[PDB]
């Protein structure tokens, strides 16, 4: 029976043999009646897997992007200041947090001057740190 073939072949339910997945196709399962075409990682995308007989290639992104999604579906820019990188990609810093780093970072909280004793000499921004005063 064709279901005894390895990884790596295709084989037909009318001839069985395990003929060997040919050049750029791939086949992880077994005696499939066909083998799937390779992916290829170009563009903004580069292979961080590349493809074989028995697995498939497998995609990065390039310098100054990150991978979106599932499964490195798409890339995105990194990340501005104000902006932070969680799973759903790029997001703004909520109120009372910043991040003044640019592709880089995590939103941290606004210093709170009542808490060191002092006043506030400037606000606060999404990319920018409150500044604080003197002592009272
Ligand atoms: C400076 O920080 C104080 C206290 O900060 C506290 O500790 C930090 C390390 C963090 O863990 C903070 O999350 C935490 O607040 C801030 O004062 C606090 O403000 C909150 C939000 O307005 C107050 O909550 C309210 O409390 C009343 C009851 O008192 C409720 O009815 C409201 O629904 C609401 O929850 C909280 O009372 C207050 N806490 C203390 C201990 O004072 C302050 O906002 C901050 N200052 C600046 C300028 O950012």
């Given at each position: ?27 992880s ?27 498939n290639?497998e995609?990065?992104?390039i ?14 820019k ?17 109120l009372?947090?910043?991040?003044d ?36």
């Open positions: 029976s064709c279901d005894n073939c390895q990884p790596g072949t295709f084989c037909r339910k009318y001839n069985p043999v395990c003929k060997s997945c040919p050049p750029s196709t791939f086949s399962i077994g005696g499939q009646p066909n083998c799937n075409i390779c992916r290829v990682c170009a563009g903004y995308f580069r292979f961080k897997k590349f493809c074989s007989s028995t697995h290639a995609c990065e992104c310098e100054g992007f990150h991978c979106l999604g599932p499964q490195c579906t798409r890339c995105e990194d990340c501005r200041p104000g902006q932070e990188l969680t799973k759903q990609g790029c997001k703004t810093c909520s009372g947090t910043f991040n780093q640019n592709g880089t970072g995590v939103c941290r909280p606004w210093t709170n001057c009542s808490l060191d004793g002092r006043s506030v000499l400037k606000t606060g921004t999404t990319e920018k740190d409150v500044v604080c005063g003197p002592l009272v």
